[PDB]
Paper text:
Here, we determine cryo-EM structures of the [name] defense complex, revealing [name] as a heptameric, two-layered AAA+ ATPase and [name] as a dodecameric, hollow complex with twelve surface-exposed deaminase active sites. [name] and [name] join to form a giant assembly up to 10 MDa, with [name] docked as a funnel over the [name] active site. Our results define ATP mononucleotide deamination as a determinant of [name] immunity and reveal supramolecular assembly of a nucleotide-modifying machine as a mechanism of anti-phage defense.
We analyzed mixed samples of purified E. coli [name] and [name] by negative-stain EM and observed gigantic flower-like arrangements with a central hub surrounded by up to six “petals”. Further analysis with cryo-EM confirmed specific [name]-[name] co-complex formation and allowed us to determine a 6.7 Å structure of a representative single-petal complex. In the [name]-[name] complex, [name] is positioned such that the central heptameric channel funnels directly into the catalytic core of [name]. In agreement with negative-stain EM analysis of multi-petal complexes, the [name] heptamer footprint sits primarily over a single [name] protomer and leaves room for a total of 12 docked [name] complexes on the [name] core dodecameric shell. We introduced several mutations predicted to disrupt the formation of the [name]-[name] complex, including charge-swap mutations of conserved residues in the [name] crown (K150E, E151K, and R162E) and observed that mutations to residues involved in [name]-[name] complex formation significantly decrease or ablate [name] defense. Modeling of a complete ∼10 MDa flower-like [name]-[name] complex demonstrates that the [name] [name] active site remains solvent-accessible, suggesting that supramolecular assembly could represent that active state of the [name] defense complex. Instead, we observed that the addition of [name] to [name] leads to enhanced conversion of ATP to ITP supporting that activation of [name] in vivo likely leads to induction of [name] activity.
Author numbering:
A (entry chain S): 35 to 50, 69 to 76, 81 to 94, 102 to 140, 147 to 183, 190 to 395, 412 to 519, 524 to 661, ...
B (entry chain M): 35 to 50, 69 to 76, 81 to 94, 102 to 140, 147 to 183, 190 to 395, 412 to 474
C (entry chain R): 475 to 519, 524 to 661, 704 to 897, 909 to 934
């Protein structure tokens, strides 16, 4: 607005090149300026080359328009007319010069018939405009030329007319578009200045070098003369018209969302976009939503407006999900983006299956592999930055109200990249790079996911297929116990015998188990495998029977191959099914955001790195019984793995879950319990006290963490034999931790007798892994004294 | 159906760009919409480009159909007439431009002969639309365009006709197709606006890159301007139109399996397909078949209708093996896929030996090599 | 390119005018990153290979898309670590690889570095200086580069007291980053830092940093780091701690001298090039980098101050950049470390005058007199553990030569 205003003043104070350019609706600005001028100058009807015949001279177009203006100003109320037609006829008969594909000699005499000498339509034009001014009573005239985005080759002819006819004093020219394109135009057009034979002859690198250098020299040489910089128009953007983060807001606009808003209910523009993004993405009003909405404002006015005019209208239609309606708009808004991205186009093939491989694919064009699961528009690619937004919207849409679907997403989309970059990037060249990623995808069936246990058991083999540095079968979140119990080894350490476990614990560690079929057929135990089983079983249904079926399938020893580059349960069933009847009803409010699940995976994966580094050098012959922090066993390692899992869960959920408007984690150095649970216990205490003070429950806030601690398959691992720190300072904290667990769950997980036995037939707890021998662990030396 | 109804309401509450798009049969839905339209807007007979001659303008096509409509509405029961002939005559005269491979200068006097100046065929078209609305007592005119699946290049002709001529407040258009093709078309001629020599010379990866980014940016901006997201119809698929696993069934269809089928024996659609797959697969009623048929229903409606209408048809004939008739259907349904696969084409070399190598090849293209013999509908390739 | 260079210089100035944090961020990201690519990253680089290498480099540090100076500090620490040879001394260009595993039977009272033994404004500064690389063995390095990145981060966030604490956590907290794929108890420190902010935000308005001055600062300071590293790989003797004579060095001396080279280059280039002043108070002298001593830097300080007083110039009007850098609370602790202060009679007298000059420039006494005498013979604002912090790689077999 101030833009075109200053524009008008600039034109008016110019008469006292004459080319002005608006960088880029561009047509909206130009035409608004058009009416603004309606210092006496006559405006000319806007000229769009793309609205003009493929073979026309802008000269003829302008001539016809000038005809209408001069004639009607003259049909109003004579000498001017006939002389004008004299100029007109001179134009016309000299006009062929523009069109003719040849030179015919007969026109030499025509040129021999009568202020410089010849038949120059340029001058013809300048006296034409002279007479036109004489009639119209304006000091000059403006010619206008529309954006050539639809067909940018047209503007070239306008360009020649520029050099050839508009080199006149009473003329002002206005052009619109993106000068980069014009640069593209001229760079090519010069190339036709070359002799082809030249081009196929001197095709050596140095020669191409000077040839280009001259070409760009000429390109700039032109663009200066065509578009003097003083006359170029900036065209502030919406972000340049709207508060960046509130320290701005130069003349806010306001746009409508529902029908009425009688000029007072207009809900900002920044505010409305923030609403759309946050509640259509489960984003909360944290510091990301603003940056995303700014990276939504940066896109052209048309795209942003249409995507912000479709969402709310269809909201109105539906109301007579926000995350799904939001992805609906982005779907069309970035379809060409996505389409060129090669992403799922089949709206009938969206699912949660295609989603995870969509995240993976995006994380291959964006490179990253470090936080690409964050899906934030960090890429330079202006097509990838918005594909990120659309994919985040779709992930939220898929995960709305689904605990096990959230589990599936976090596993497949998040951990797949985490495992690749740290574990599959040592193999991959570029074509070999995409091949390697292809067979990686094939091994995992990513996007084509079979089951969470499937993905976990593939990930177990992947994890096993690398680590060195003492070859300890104690990885990020797994513990490689010995299956062939034949190794001359001390104390009560032994192999893992599942038969020694009972009830809800035997099946628990059997499901956390991973028996890969590399060749050794090593039996791995991984928090990854147990999490996959939990995700598999957490949204099956409320049925009692199929729950048992999935129970067996997950607990049934399933055997998988390495990637080619290396009666007794009716109680646990009832407990698990009660946990499911809780989960399937309290999960309907889960609204995890892609950023939320990105943070959860990042934190837990790195806590797994910590627990994998800190626990390998703690395996001693007496490390069993895990009384101290210097005694380690497979049981304590896996207990700390699950502890890292749940601690990251709670921390990231309190921080970033969209259901939460404020933080109860507290402003502190969030650190992880690696060899002690002090961090987790203290954070739980603070969160619980905050919930009590603000009159909230762990179901209202932290429902996912609540259900995760409420999983019957996880409880045996929390306080396993050999993994509870028996130091007095450790004992009081672990006791408080158990009390907090019982309070939050609403139930006492472990009996007082069980707790005292542990702290000095035990179902609901692991009793075999403490004495289970981990392959590779020497168990030579003992724990140091003092 | 309800899709057609909703879109009809959307179009009607639109007159108070102007293009509604149909993603994808599609022809059936469009014709249903047409009939539903028969708030006064005048409709015209469909516009099927792929079955319209190579060189003529969609402009002339529409002009002729308008001629017919107005002539009928005028021959029924003149002063409208001569003025309409006037408009039509100017249309014809300033119409050479489109065909013209070159500008003769002689049209310079044509463009000078007496609201932006010239002989803008778009303004002639808009005034023609004005005349049609006034004569027909209609608020606007609906234009239609059939899919260009058989010929997707001419459709850009419709695109250009829209960009030049249907940017009018008295016209609304209905396009239909799969936007992938529209994307190629935009791109398809985006790169031609380049110079051949330039593409010849700057074949360095970097320059290829910026050219591609510019082209696809421009394409995205054009597609959005042409087809606003809201104005396009999402359209339900058959699978979304039937119960996913029994937990659905929005607006069931029901199909007829044998000749009698007096509207009460119509053998489901989901249930009929499940029967067919199980029986032609020696498959039983497990959950495996359910997934096979879910990934069988998503297939194009014509494909599924032919495959399941040649199955029960031949079954009725045989009743005066089930699977043999069944894969008889598969030969015709997916033969293009199989022939693309390079696997057995001849029917008489079926045997037992050929089948082994058939699966052997199929596993070589789905990779797998672990359960590919499962033949599960697990490939990303729809072939 | 002759015009691209001028355009880039114009952009850098236009950006960094009046902005100390923006000066630091640019100075580091645009200049030191290029230098690092040169000296350390050029060792792998065909032209397509070189472009792939540069793309991977830029992707790693997010150059052009930088999140934070601390983030680039964490990335560049690992980048630096991914190479060094020649006795594998855990003291890099401007940083030192701390031993995080204290199971190494080594002499005297040398031990690990415990952040728990440190308190308040020194504990936090040292913890932020800590570089916890996610390489593999999880080697927690410490760089003056890491620290200066932290200062750049925390220097122009805002005047809010609380956000000071938030950024304080985010920076001083353990920072984890993998190697590039080619290899309460702070309530007083927060108050001091925010007072430093309340001074900087208001005295930084006149800084006019030029690209020339920015590049020259890096050029002098990086080579000063080179020399401060070369001179001190063979002075880590079993008795080298306590830094009494000029022939004993330790990790604390390393950190002090890296910061000192930083600020020395700062002062030299500010007196030499800053458009704010029309003349150079550095003087027509043999400008040398203080490497094993502070004598050169202190002579420069005394001369510059005397001429400022002669000309009626304040250190805020002149050397405002250097003034605010020296005023930094986090840089204060490394100024006079335990075992990094040369106690020689002549060394002691120059060190004392250097302390007094810094104190007068700042306008406040950093260290108590008891602190001063203890250093010359619960001490907050002072590093006390790095003196006995064993450097990974230093054999600590020999001691100081006699005579």
């Amino acid at each position: 607005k101030s833009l075109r205003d200053q524009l008008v003043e600039s034109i008016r104070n110019s008469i006292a090149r004459n080319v002005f350019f608006v960088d880029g609706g561009k047509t909206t600005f130009i035409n608004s300026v058009v009416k603004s001028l309606n210092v006496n100058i006559k405006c000319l009807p806007t000229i769009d080359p793309t609205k003009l015949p493929r073979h026309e001279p802008i000269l003829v177009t302008v001539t016809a328009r000038l005809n209408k203006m001069v004639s009607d100003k003259l049909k109003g109320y004579r000498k001017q007319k006939e002389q004008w037609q004299n100029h007109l006829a001179q134009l016309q008969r000299g006009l062929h010069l523009l069109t003719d594909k040849e030179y015919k000699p007969e026109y030499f005499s025509d040129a021999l018939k009568l202020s410089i000498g010849g038949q120059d339509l340029s001058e013809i034009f300048e006296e034409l405009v002279k007479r036109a001014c004489e009639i119209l009573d304006c000091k000059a005239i403006l010619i206008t030329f529309d954006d050539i985005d639809t067909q940018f080759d047209a503007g070239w002819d306008v360009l020649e007319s520029i050099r050839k006819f508009f080199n006149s004093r009473k003329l002002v020219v206005v052009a619109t578009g993106d000068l980069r394109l014009y640069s593209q135009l001229i760079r090519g057009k010069q190339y036709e200045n070359y002799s082809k034979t030249l081009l196929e002859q001197e095709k050596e690198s140095v020669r191409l070098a000077e040839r280009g250098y001259m070409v760009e020299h000429l390109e700039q040489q032109y663009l200066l003369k065509l578009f003097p910089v003083q006359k170029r128009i900036q065209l502030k953007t919406m972000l340049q018209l709207v508060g960046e983060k509130g320290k701005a807001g130069k003349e806010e606009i306001k746009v409508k969302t529902e029908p009425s808003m009688q000029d007072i209910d207009a809900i900002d523009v920044r505010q409305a976009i923030g609403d759309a993004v946050r509640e259509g993405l489960n984003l909360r009003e944290g510091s990301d939503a603003d940056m995303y909405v700014n990276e939504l404002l940066k896109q052209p006015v048309r795209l942003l407006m249409q995507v912000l005019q479709d969402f709310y209208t269809k909201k109105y239609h539906a109301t007579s999900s926000v995350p799904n309606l939001l992805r609906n708009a982005l779907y069309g808004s970035m379809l060409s983006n996505i389409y060129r991205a090669g992403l799922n186009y089949e709206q009938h093939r969206f699912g949660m299956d295609s989603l995870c491989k969509d995240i993976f694919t995006y994380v291959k064009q964006d490179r990253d592999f470090n936080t690409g699961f964050y899906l934030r528009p960090q890429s330079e690619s202006e097509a990838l930055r918005n594909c990120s937004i659309y994919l985040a919207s779709q992930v939220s849409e898929n995960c709305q109200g689904s605990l096990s679907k959230f589990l599936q997403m976090l596993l497949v989309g998040c951990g797949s990249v985490s495992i690749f970059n740290q574990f599959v990037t040592e193999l991959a060249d570029r074509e070999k790079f995409e091949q390697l990623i292809s067979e990686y995808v094939a091994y995992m069936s990513v996007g084509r996911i079979e089951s969470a246990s499937h993905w976990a058991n593939r990930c177990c083999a992947v994890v096993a297929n690398s680590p060195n540095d003492e070859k300890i079968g104690v990885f990020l979140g797994m513990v490689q116990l010995n299956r062939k119990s034949r190794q001359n080894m001390p104390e009560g350490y032994k192999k893992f015998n599942i038969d020694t476990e009972n009830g809800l614990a035997k099946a628990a560690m059997a499901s956390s188990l991973s028996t890969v079929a590399s060749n050794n057929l090593m039996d791995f135990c991984s928090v990854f495998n147990l999490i996959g089983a939990i995700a598999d079983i957490s949204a099956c249904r409320c049925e009692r029977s199929a729950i048992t079926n999935a129970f067996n399938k997950v607990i049934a020893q399933t055997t998988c191959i390495v990637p080619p580059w290396s009666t007794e349960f009716s109680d646990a069933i009832t407990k698990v099914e009660q946990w499911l009847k809780n989960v399937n009803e309290i999960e309907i409010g889960i609204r995890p955001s892609a950023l939320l699940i990105g943070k959860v995976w990042s934190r837990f994966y790195f806590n797994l790195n910590n627990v994998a580094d800190q626990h390998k050098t703690r395996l001693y012959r007496n490390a069993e019984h895990g009384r101290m922090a210097s005694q380690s066993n497979a049981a304590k390692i896996m207990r700390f793995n699950v502890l890292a899992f749940l601690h990251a869960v709670l921390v990231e959920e309190s921080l970033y879950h969209s259901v939460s408007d404020r933080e109860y984690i507290g402003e502190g150095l969030r650190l992880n319990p690696v060899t002690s649970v002090d961090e987790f216990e203290k954070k739980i205490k603070i969160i619980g006290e905050k919930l009590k003070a603000d009159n909230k429950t762990w179901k209202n806030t932290h429902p996912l963490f609540f259900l995760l601690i409420s999983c019957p398959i996880l409880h045996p691992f929390i306080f396993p034999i050999g993994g509870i720190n028996c130091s007095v300072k450790a004992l009081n904290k672990e006791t408080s931790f158990n009390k907090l667990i019982d309070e939050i769950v609403g139930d006492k997980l472990l009996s007082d007798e069980e707790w005292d036995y542990l702290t000095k037939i035990f179902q609901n707890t692991i009793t075999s892994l403490n004495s289970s021998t981990i392959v590779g662990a020497s168990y030579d030396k003992d724990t140091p004294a003092r």
